[PDB]
Amino acid sequence: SCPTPWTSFQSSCYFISTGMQSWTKSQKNCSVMGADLVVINTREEQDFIIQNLKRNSSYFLGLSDPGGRRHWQWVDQTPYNENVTFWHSGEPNNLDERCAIINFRSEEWGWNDIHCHVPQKSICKMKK
Amino acid sequence: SCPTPWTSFQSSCYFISTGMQSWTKSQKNCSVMGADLVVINTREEQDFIIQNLKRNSSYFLGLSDPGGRRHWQWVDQTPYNENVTFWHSGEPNNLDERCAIINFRSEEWGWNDIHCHVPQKSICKMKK
Incomplete structure (x- = not known):
């Protein structure tokens, strides 16, 4: 079963951070333990997670938009070709x-979108 | 065989607006003439269009990002399902x-990206 302070649910192990860090630093921290920032696949997973969180705390999920390039579209559906712009x-x-x-x-509980560099606590997940 | 005020290049006809309108209104104006806001496929096309423009004017092209929902991604590449959020x-x-x-x-001439609601002149294109 799941390692030392990790919490078990179904076939996964969950870790709740106490530190406040950027999303990137949070992901790196999860990664170093062989994990990822939490990916929430189902309602039942959402429900398990929130029972293990504190209402006075706020946490990064493994959900993001990496930004950069916009998804430019031609109005007649001609595909955008970056090499001819x-x-x-x-x-x-x-x-x-x-x-x-x-x-x-x-x-009650839910998700919000924010700037990735604002420090938050975080939730890691890996397969057991 | 492009009608009078339209200019002719390769197998296409081009119309240069005088009016300043939002991108959406500009597209509708092209559309009711059987056309679209210009889609630029090649360097030759870019070059031709430039010949028909005034340097004291700025024009919508048929290239946009229609905005709305971000391209959210789970950090382990699990596809985002908008119906389990x-x-x-x-x-x-x-x-x-x-x-x-x-x-x-x-x-000289080039493309900028701006908000779609700011009124600009525009360029319409249709097949010959």
Whole structure:
């Protein structure tokens, strides 16, 4: 079964961080223990997780938008080909990265999207 | 065989607007003429279009990012299923609509990306 302070559910092991770090640092921390920031596949998983969280805490999930390139589309559905474009220097603007957190509102538990560099606690998951 | 005010290049007909309208209204104006906002497929096409433009003007192209929902990704590549999510009400934040324009910098001609609601001139294209 699951290692030392990890919590077991179905075929997975869950770790709850006490430290507040960026999403990237949170992912690295999970990674070093052989895990990932939590991927929530089902309602039942969501429910298990929230029972193991504290209402006075807020946590990164393993859900993000890496930003960068926008998904440019031609209006007639011609596929966008980045190698045949004529953007001025400095253009186009990159999409900002976004990161999901889970936390409690008086609505109860749910996800919110925030800037990835804001420090939050975090939740790791790996296979048992 | 492009009708009077339309200009002819390869197998296409091009119309240069005088009016300044949102991207969406600009597309509708092209559309009711049997056309679309211009889709630029090659360097030759870019070059032709430039010949028909005024350097004191800036024009919508038929290239956009229709915004809406971010391309959320689970960190272990599990596909995002929008029907198994637990966003708090009013979350996540919608992505803004972005649209390409073509204009002149003294760099010369190139594309910029702006918000789709700002009125600009426009370029329509249709098959010959």
